[PDB]
Design a protein around this ligand. Structure first.
Ligand code: FMN
Ligand code: SF4
Ligand code: SF4
Ligand code: SF4
Ligand code: SF4
Ligand code: SF4
Ligand code: FES
Lengths: 106, 262, 118, 214, 431, 35, 52
């Protein structure tokens, strides 16, 4: 809620990825916090298993409600940390409500 | 004058003065340890080395107990497993939930020994302790809340480095490891404390947050900074050198490397 | 004199130009466990890795970059390397030498082993 | 509540002036002679106690001076100072009131004495009076559990205390009068209060019931 | 052959000057029979002294109660060129124990002569008496007694004209209960933090300054001269078999006349409380959970106290221990949970910290016990506390852990209903 | 009753006085273990 | 059993043992005792088997 990114560069979500679709690099940021310099999910190697949503400890990475994100080029589907954060900002209102709905089942 | 002792019913001939842990090592059993390092002196504080000797009411610390002829070391008895579970529970009672952010994660003796010799749940329903972090230099990043008071760093600094600047201050659960003053631990072999520390309390500042253990590819090589020829493991991920870790060569470098090499 | 090189299907460049290292992996000094130091491993020589222009991901052209094989004994790994016609280098196993440990020595009357702090 | 890390301050910096007085140096020589040669590090506790007695508290400079005198690493002196409670690592009041609040003393309404001390001094436990003459701290078994309640001062045991007794002792200390150590009730020692139930008869004397073969 | 012990005449009392009414200086000690024919005892030989101790059947007064004669004989082996030392443990840190304070303050020459005799038995050049730092005045008294002995020639070169060179040194502690433990005492004397060693190297083979050392309680050492002069069989006469001797007892707590008294071993607890302690406050009906042998020993309910005999084995049968012989009495107008919690907090503050079991579990038990005293816990927590105590006990490097575990186990075992009642009451209060 | 009047340095002064009566101390053979 | 099945999210976020087990299970996984098995079920299309 502060606006700080939830990711703490655990890379365990990268580790559990069945298709190795997540590439993560991290360095201590100017504040000294453990943040990701690089977070990439290849939406073309992803199997949309739902892992790393269960695996990620801080709830940072979430498969949101959107399904209509078709692209006219292959490169558009190789997401970047900026693109993923923009998606999180775009869909946070729905994502938070869905997590609230299902957080007790998890 | 080898004497005969039995580890889980198997006869092993060991020289007098051999500890129970080394006798188990002879048969391949690696007694779980947190505070015992072969290079360093024996301490016995950790208490994870406790094992049951047949016909003996009290479990013994494998690290610090010399074997006696005819002893049968029951390394997997119910008593030994329960002692390991209790010691692990005590170790994890006040340990911070920093694993996702702890650099030692994936290479932490506490994690693996909990997954192998400990319970899968916590009965601790109270608040955990916190320790103010100490600054000991520009190379070792210190998060002392993760410390398990194994005293490995103190014994290393005293015995190998020769710098008697790290010690324990206070008593009880408030006991803390680190220079009482704002002293900086400076030595050629200071970086080895990062390796020796079982938990991620002491970690490499330059390597902090850069990578996780499973990702790295390990290449065995030799250092060139000095003519000692220390054997090293060069850890690379995605074609980029991530860290230099010591490799054991008893003849040249036991398990240590200089700060310049590291 | 067994040779399966023709039958393997490996291209000639990797058969001839690659050096395979037969070794017992050293213990990760970060951990005291020794379970990962009990079996011989065969690993191929490292080759070029470059950054992908689009994303910066590490790209490789070495088919055997990630190929690692486990062998119970050194002789078996050597036999496999010879049968597959790979040049092999064997590093002898490194075993921790036996040490003498005494808790009493920490409190010696006359020796230097006495410990200032416990 | 005392911290076990040292933050350098103008009062407690390493350059704070402390050196043993020459008589204390002779006492240090006497202390060192007690322990075997080559183990002069054993003098650390008595020498630190001497330093605390001389200065009233142990500054970091005092610990460094002890380490230098005994040729021991300073960190060991730091460890000894932190581990043992009696050593004072911060300045304390002229008279240190230590109230034993352990189970045996607790059963003998020690909290009453503690509260009376708090009210008279005006300071809560762990605080020093603005006059800097009294510091109140609770402690564990001081060894006179049988003569509870019992509050120790700089070095004297004022045992078998009642609220009025403790208030009177505090008044005497404020006046500068030195109270006599011992049970402030009628009893003189661990003797049964009403009367001696043992040792009523005179001592038997030398040579009593001595084994013939000796 | 007597089936009921509990009455000791003044003649048989070793500590004649226990209450201090007679002079504590050398003149008084000599007048009361101290330092009598000590030369003859020393000349008789180490073996005769150890045999006298063994025949006495004396058990260690520290609280462990190991056979004193066998313990001292461990040091009888020929010297290897290292010096030998005898360390008298005057720490007296156990909550409720005050005997050693009386012994040192009012009868120091007893301890000095006992040190000489024991050192002769152990072949020890010198004896170090570790005295609790808080006991400053008693330490000064002991130093004065030692000075008088040195002037008289009783100690020092040619001690008592026996051709035996012995020195008594008094070392004062810095305020730590753990230092009472023998290895912790040795470490503290050596100048390190007072943290117990691992036993596998035993104190006899390696001790203070890395030399053979025997650590004995002040009472055990003090009784040695009287045991030698009067004879071992004299000590054996008092008390049951294996529990022989006259033991100092500290009766404290909710008793009309708190006092320290000397009575034969095996004296009935009710007899000791009523005869010398003035009876329980409110009478015997009000008795609730007397602590038999100090804080470390588990509490016993009133029913057990009615017929219990104060000897080592009998108290062990009671699931308690004689310990330091300190009797702490609680009247029914007491919160047993609060008292046991205070003792557990004492253990938390007095823990060294090196042993993970003790360092963490004792703090854990203290927090759980505070929650219990408030009542802010579920009933299941009691079994969890029992299991935690069992984990702590027998796995620590020092008995302090077991000392912490035992009171919690005793409280659970004998007053479990009270804790559940308080938990239910708290739940009702907060609804 | 003598204990009623003891000063801060009484114990150390008594030790200083007793120094003369004390016998020669044993030596490990080295100035310090660190030596 | 938290050494085979991951702990619940609240437990992982509140308990140290649960966090350790979650970390290891989602990074290393659970070691399976050495062995081999052919397990078959009556799948809708017939017998489905895994020789693991
Ligand atoms: C935590 C703890 C505190 C102890 N405190 C004392 C003590 O204050 N005085 C004492 O004589 N023994 C104390 N002991 C017992 C000693 O470790 C040891 O058993 C004793 O000195 C042996 O004396 P003995 O030979 O007369 O039995 C303590 C033990 C423990 C575990
Ligand atoms: S939860 Fe997501 S953002 Fe956080 S460390 Fe794991 S992969 Fe990175
Ligand atoms: S949901 Fe996507 S990012 Fe997560 S593990 Fe599956 S493929 Fe990888
Ligand atoms: S910092 Fe690490 S090595 Fe040092 S005592 Fe703590 S856990 Fe042991
Ligand atoms: S070192 Fe401590 S914080 Fe880091 S993974 Fe291990 S137990 Fe967790
Ligand atoms: S049991 Fe407690 S007091 Fe004894 S050594 Fe261990 S931590 Fe220290
Ligand atoms: S290191 Fe574990 S008991 Fe010694």
């Amino acid at each position: 809620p502060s606006g700080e990114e939830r990711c703490i560069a655990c890379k365990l979500c990268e580790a559990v990825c069945p298709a190795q679709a997540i590439t993560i690099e991290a360095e201590p940021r100017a504040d000294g916090s453990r943040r990701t310099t690089r977070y990439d999910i290849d939406m073309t190697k992803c199997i949309y298993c739902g892992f790393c949503q269960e695996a990620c400890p801080v709830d940072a990475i979430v498969e949101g409600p959107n399904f209509e994100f078709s692209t006219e080029t292959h490169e558009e589907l190789l997401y970047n940390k900026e693109k993923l954060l923009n998606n999180g900002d775009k869909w946070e209102a729905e994502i938070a409500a869905n997590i609230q709905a299902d957080y007790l089942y998890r | 004058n080898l004497i005969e002792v039995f580890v889980d019913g198997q006869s092993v001939m060991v020289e007098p003065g051999t500890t129970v842990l080394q006798a188990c090592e002879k048969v391949g059993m690696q007694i779980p340890r947190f505070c015992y390092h072969e290079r360093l002196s024996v301490a016995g504080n950790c208490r994870m080395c406790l094992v049951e000797i047949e016909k003996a009411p009290k479990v013994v610390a494998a690290c610090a107990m010399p074997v006696m002829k005819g002893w049968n070391i029951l390394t997997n008895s119910e008593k030994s497993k329960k002692a390991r579970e209790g010691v692990m529970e005590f170790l994890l009672a006040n340990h911070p939930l920093d694993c996702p952010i702890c650099d030692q994660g994936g290479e932490c003796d506490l994690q693996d020994q909990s997954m192998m010799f400990g319970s899968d749940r916590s009965r601790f329903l109270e608040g955990k302790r916190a320790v103010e972090d100490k600054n000991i230099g520009p190379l070792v990043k210190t998060i002392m809340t993760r410390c398990i008071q194994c005293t490995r760093c103190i014994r290393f600094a005293s015995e190998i480095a020769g710098v008697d600047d790290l010690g324990t201050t206070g008593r009880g659960n408030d006991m803390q490891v680190g220079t009482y003053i704002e002293k900086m631990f400076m030595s050629e072999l200071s970086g080895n404390i990062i390796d020796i520390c079982p938990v991620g309390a002491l970690t490499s500042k330059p390597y902090a947050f850069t990578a996780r253990p499973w990702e790295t590819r390990k290449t065995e090589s030799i250092d060139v900074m000095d003519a000692v020829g220390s054997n090293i493991v060069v850890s690379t991920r995605t074609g980029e050198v991530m860290r230099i870790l010591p490799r054991m060569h008893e003849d040249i470098n036991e398990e240590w490397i200089s700060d310049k090499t590291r | 004199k067994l040779d399966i090189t023709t039958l393997t299907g490996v291209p000639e460049e990797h058969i001839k130009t690659r050096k395979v290292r037969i070794f017992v992996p050293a213990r990760n000094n970060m951990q005291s466990g020794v379970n990962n130091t009990k079996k011989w491993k065969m690993e191929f020589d490292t080759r070029e890795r470059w950054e992908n222009p689009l994303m910066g991901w590490s790209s490789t052209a070495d088919p055997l970059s990630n190929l690692v094989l486990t062998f119970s004994t050194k002789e078996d790994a050597v036999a496999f390397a010879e049968k597959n016609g790979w040049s092999f280098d064997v590093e002898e196993r490194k075993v921790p030498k036996p040490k003498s440990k005494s808790y009493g020595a920490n409190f010696s009357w006359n020796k230097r082993t006495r410990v200032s702090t416990k | 509540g005392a911290l076990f890390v040292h933050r350098d301050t103008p009062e407690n910096n390493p350059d704070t002036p402390f050196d043993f007085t020459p008589e204390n140096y002779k006492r240090i020589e006497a202390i060192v002679k007690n322990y075997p040669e080559g183990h002069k590090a054993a003098a650390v506790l008595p020498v630190l106690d001497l330093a605390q007695r001389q200065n009233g508290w142990l500054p970091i400079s005092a610990m460094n001076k002890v380490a230098e005198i005994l040729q021991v690493p300073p960190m060991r002196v730091y460890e000894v100072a932190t581990f043992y409670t009696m050593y004072n690592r911060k300045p304390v009041g002229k008279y240190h009131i230590q109230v034993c609040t352990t189970t045996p003393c607790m059963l003998r309404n020690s909290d009453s004495i503690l509260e009376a001390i708090q009210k008279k001094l005006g300071i809560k436990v762990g605080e020093t009076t603005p006059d800097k003459l009294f510091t109140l701290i609770e402690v564990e078994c001081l060894g006179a559990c049988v003569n509870a309640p019992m509050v120790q001062i700089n070095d004297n045991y004022y045992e078998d205390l009642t609220p009025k007794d403790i208030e009177e002792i505090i008044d005497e200390l404020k006046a500068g009068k030195i109270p006599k150590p011992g049970p402030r009730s009628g009893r003189f020692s661990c003797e049964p209060a009403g009367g001696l139930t043992s040792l009523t008869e005179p001592p038997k004397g030398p040579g009593f019931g001595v084994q013939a073969g000796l | 052959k007597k089936t009921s012990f509990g009455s000791l005449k003044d003649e048989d009392r070793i500590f004649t000057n226990l209450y201090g009414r007679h002079d504590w200086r050398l003149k008084g000690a000599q007048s009361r029979g101290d330092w009598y024919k000590t030369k003859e005892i020393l000349l008789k030989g180490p073996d005769w002294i150890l045999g006298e101790v063994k025949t006495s059947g004396l058990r260690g007064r520290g609280g462990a109660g190991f056979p004193t004669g066998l313990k001292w004989s461990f040091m009888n082996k020929p010297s290897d060129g290292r010096p030998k030392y005898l360390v008298v443990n005057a720490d007296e840190g156990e909550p409720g124990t005050c005997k050693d304070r009386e012994i040192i303050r009012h009868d120091p020459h007893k301890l000095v002569e006992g040190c000489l005799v024991g050192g002769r038995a152990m072949g020890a050049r010198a004896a170090y008496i570790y005295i609790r730092g808080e006991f400053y005045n008693e330490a000064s008294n002991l130093q004065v007694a030692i000075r008088e002995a040195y002037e008289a020639g009783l100690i020092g070169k040619n001690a008592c004209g026996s051709g035996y060179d012995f020195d008594v040194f008094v070392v004062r502690g810095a305020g730590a209960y753990i230092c009472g433990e023998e290895t912790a005492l040795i470490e503290s004397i050596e100048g390190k933090q007072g943290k117990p060693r691992l036993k596998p190297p035993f104190p006899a083979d390696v001790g203070v300054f890395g030399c053979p050392t025997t650590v004995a309680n002040v009472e055990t050492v003090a009784v040695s001269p009287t045991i030698c002069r009067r004879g071992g069989a004299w000590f054996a006469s008092f008390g049951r078999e294996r529990n022989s001797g006259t033991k100092l007892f500290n009766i404290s707590g909710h008793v009309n006349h708190p006092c320290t008294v000397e009575e034969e071993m095996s004296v009935p607890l009710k007899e000791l409380i009523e005869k010398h302690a003035g009876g329980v406050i409110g009478g015997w009906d009000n008795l609730l959970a007397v602590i038999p042998g100090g804080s470390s020993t588990p509490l016993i309910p009133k029913s057990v106290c009615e017929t219990v005999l104060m000897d080592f084995d009998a108290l062990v049968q009671a699931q308690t221990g004689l310990g330091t012989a300190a009797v702490i009495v609680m009247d029914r107008s007491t919160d047993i949970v609060k008292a046991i919690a205070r003792l557990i907090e004492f253990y938390k503050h007095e823990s060294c910290g090196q042993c993970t079991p003790c360092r963490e579990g004792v703090d854990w038990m203290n927090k759980v016990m505070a929650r219990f005293v408030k009542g802010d816990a579920r009933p299941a927590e009691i079994d969890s506390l029992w299991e935690i105590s069992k984990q702590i006990e027998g796995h620590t490097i020092c008995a302090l852990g077991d000392g912490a575990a035992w009171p919690v186990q005793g409280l659970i075992r004998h007053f479990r209903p009270e804790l559940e009642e308080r938990m239910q009451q708290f739940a009702l209060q907060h609804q | 009753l003598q204990h009623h009047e003891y000063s801060t340095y009484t114990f150390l002064d008594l030790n200083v006085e007793l120094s003369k009566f004390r016998m020669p101390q044993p030596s490990s053979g080295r100035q310090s273990p660190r030596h | 059993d938290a050494k085979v099945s991951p702990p619940k999210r609240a437990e992982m976020k509140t308990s140290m043992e649960s966090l350790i087990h979650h970390f290891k299970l989602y990074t290393e996984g659970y070691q399976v005792p050495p062995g081999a098995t052919y397990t078959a079920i009556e799948a809708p299309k017939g017998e489905f088997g895994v020789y693991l």
